[PDB]
């Protein structure tokens, strides 16, 4: 399925530390963020996505249209400018964030009743699994 709608609660988070370190997120921030349960709220209508990520101490919200390039300032993360593009490869939603960091982006897909999110930066891969609320 390409339907990623829903409220998704984090089951697992592997190598979030390595991903954040590759983004040059400060030590203090990383130490808090790695411990936190994330909730991902995805509102998907056709090509239009509105995504909200919440935890006790940090938020990150992004809206995008599949197949439409969009400039991003990664406020609250690493504060960089990237040129972002989100497209489908089969039922995998693929984001490339073109800019200073190499191999920066993410891939997201549904398998069973779970959402998988693979965050990449440089030589680091973070793997997250969410289950539907």
UniProtKB/Swiss-Prot annotation:
Higher expression in adult small intestine and to a much lesser extent in fetal kidney. Keywords: Cytoplasm, Retinol-binding, Transport, Vitamin A. GO terms for cellular component: cytosol; nucleus. One of its GO terms (molecular function) is retinol binding. All-trans-retinol binds at residues 40, 108. Disulfide bonds: none annotated. One of its GO terms (biological process) is epidermis development. The keyword Cell membrane does not apply. It comes from the Eukaryota. Gene3D superfamilies: 2.40.128.20. Coiled coil: none annotated. Forms a beta-barrel structure that accommodates hydrophobic ligands in its interior. Intracellular transport of retinol. Belongs to the calycin superfamily. Fatty-acid binding protein (FABP) family. This is Retinol-binding protein 2. It comes from Homo sapiens (Human).
């Amino acid at each position: 399925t390409r339907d990623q709608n829903g409220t998704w609660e984090m089951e697992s988070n592997e190598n979030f530390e390595g991903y954040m370190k590759a983004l040059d997120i400060d030590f203090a921030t990383r130490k808090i963020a790695v411990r936190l349960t994330q909730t991902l709220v995805i509102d998907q209508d056709g090509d239009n996505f509105k995504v909200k990520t919440t935890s006790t101490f940090f938020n990150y919200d992004v809206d995008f249209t599949v197949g439409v390039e969009f400039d991003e300032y990664t406020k609250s993360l690493d504060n960089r400018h990237v040129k972002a593009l989100v497209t489908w490869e089969g039922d995998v939603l693929v984001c490339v964030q073109k800019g200073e960091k190499e191999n920066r982006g993410w891939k997201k897909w549904i398998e069973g009743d779970k959402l998988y999110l693979e965050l990449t930066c440089g030589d680091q891969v973070c793997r997250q699994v969410f289950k539907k609320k």
